[PDB]
Design an enzyme around this catalytic site. Sequence first.
Site, PDB file in Angstrom:
ATOM      1  N   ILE A  41       0.946  -0.843   0.385  1.00  0.00           N
ATOM      2  CA  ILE A  41       0.019  -0.134  -0.190  1.00  0.00           C
ATOM      3  C   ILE A  41       0.446   1.412   0.525  1.00  0.00           C
ATOM      4  CG2 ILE A  41      -2.036   1.106   1.400  1.00  0.00           C
ATOM      5  CD1 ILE A  41      -1.798  -1.270   2.823  1.00  0.00           C
ATOM      6  N   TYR A  42       0.664   2.016  -0.755  1.00  0.00           N
ATOM      7  CA  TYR A  42       1.778   3.017  -0.809  1.00  0.00           C
ATOM      8  C   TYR A  42       0.830   4.805  -0.539  1.00  0.00           C
ATOM      9  CZ  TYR A  42       4.846   1.539  -4.060  1.00  0.00           C
ATOM     10  OH  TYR A  42       5.985   0.268  -5.244  1.00  0.00           O
ATOM     11  N   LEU A  43       1.520   4.849   0.678  1.00  0.00           N
ATOM     12  CA  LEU A  43       1.216   6.272   1.145  1.00  0.00           C
ATOM     13  C   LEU A  43       1.421   7.988   0.728  1.00  0.00           C
ATOM     14  CD1 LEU A  43       1.197   4.951   4.569  1.00  0.00           C
ATOM     15  CD2 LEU A  43      -0.911   5.024   3.117  1.00  0.00           C
ATOM     16  N   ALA A 103      -2.770   5.488  -2.010  1.00  0.00           N
ATOM     17  CA  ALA A 103      -3.028   6.075  -3.109  1.00  0.00           C
ATOM     18  C   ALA A 103      -2.650   5.282  -4.288  1.00  0.00           C
ATOM     19  CB  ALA A 103      -1.125   6.881  -2.672  1.00  0.00           C
ATOM     20  N   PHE A 104      -2.027   4.227  -3.779  1.00  0.00           N
ATOM     21  CA  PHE A 104      -2.517   2.888  -4.462  1.00  0.00           C
ATOM     22  C   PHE A 104      -2.218   1.910  -4.085  1.00  0.00           C
ATOM     23  CE2 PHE A 104       1.815   3.244  -6.860  1.00  0.00           C
ATOM     24  CZ  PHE A 104       2.051   4.781  -6.070  1.00  0.00           C
TER      25      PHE A 104
END
Lengths: 176, 176
Positions: A41-43, A103-104
């Site tokens: 999980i990109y933040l 974010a994605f």
Amino acid sequence: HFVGKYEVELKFRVMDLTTLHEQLVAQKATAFTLNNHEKDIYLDANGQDLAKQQISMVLREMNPSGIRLWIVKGPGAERCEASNIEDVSKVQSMLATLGYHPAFTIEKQRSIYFVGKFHITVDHLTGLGDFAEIAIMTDDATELDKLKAECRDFANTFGLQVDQQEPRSYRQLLGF
Amino acid sequence: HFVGKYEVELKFRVMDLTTLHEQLVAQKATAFTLNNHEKDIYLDANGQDLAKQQISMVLREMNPSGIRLWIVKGPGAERCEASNIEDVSKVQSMLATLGYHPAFTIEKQRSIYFVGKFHITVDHLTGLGDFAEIAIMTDDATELDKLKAECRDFANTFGLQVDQQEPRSYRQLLGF
Ligand SMILES: Nc1ncnc2c1ncn2[C@@H]1O[C@@H]2COP(=O)(O)O[C@H]2[C@H]1O
Ligand SMILES: Nc1ncnc2c1ncn2[C@@H]1O[C@@H]2COP(=O)(O)O[C@H]2[C@H]1O
Ligand SMILES: [Mn+2]
Ligand SMILES: [Mn+2]
Ligand SMILES: [Mn+2]
């Protein structure tokens, strides 16, 4: 094997997995972790603040190995640090307080092998296919020269060739 | 004991450490940590972005228990989350990449005891003196007033009176 702030690496498309496995055997590679599904999980902040600095921040869950990592990559393509964490939702909440939100997501299947001081990571991503990366971590920026040359020598002896090099990150390849 | 995103807490100057300790025995308190040295490194952005939101962010090392914590307090009163971490310097480096740098450090001696659902902390700070914090964590915002009143009752029972209540934080008391 994972000690440092810099990850020196060379990544390649893999066109034949059987040959890769033979290349592994020929180098007497040992298994670290095999066939994990990794969900990253990109933040980032609301205005993509980190990406505008060439920084990525990931919460990674690896199954079935159970490992959970908080990762900060960048600025740019060498800097990389990770911390083991026990509770992903807790860290994600704490990061949300600071203004970072999902974010994605990038998912992959990953295996990691060791040959001497090098780690070889073999990845599969659904749209994209198979990749292999030769890497070594260091804490000493003065060494990045020596180590990148050493990665190249190993990649050459291993059988991984410049025509198959892929310099882009997965987020670059996927358009995130 | 340390489950939740809210922490209800009352801090008191301690005028009579003997009575406090006598009452910890009377009430069969369990020692979680005893006389640990705690070093708290506070981190913020160059512009004090977190303080401007009434957020504090601390990396805490407690010895000899070997507990290490990343703590985010705020924004504002009663919000608090923490995560165990393996290595302070590693997390500190990661947060520096995100723009958070050491602003100041607070050291203290601290013991932490449990009595039923409460925890009570007995603190000594070289310049400042002796304090006790009575606290409980929860995820439920609907009970916060009840919990605070229960903390005050419980504190009186150790000899800690409203006139010795201290609303200022250690960072405020130390001029940070
Ligand atoms: N247990 C682990 N498994 C895999 N990689 C790890 C582990 N601990 C630290 N790392 C490092 O953290 C890095 C995060 O980004 P990478 O996936 O590119 O490469 C990873 C490794 O170099
Ligand atoms: N293992 C732990 N040891 C001590 N405190 C913890 C732990 N886990 C969470 N906490 C909480 O983290 C908080 C940080 O701020 P306080 O010192 O006011 O109070 C602390 C505790 O309520
Ligand atoms: Mn890598
Ligand atoms: Mn790696
Ligand atoms: Mn507490």
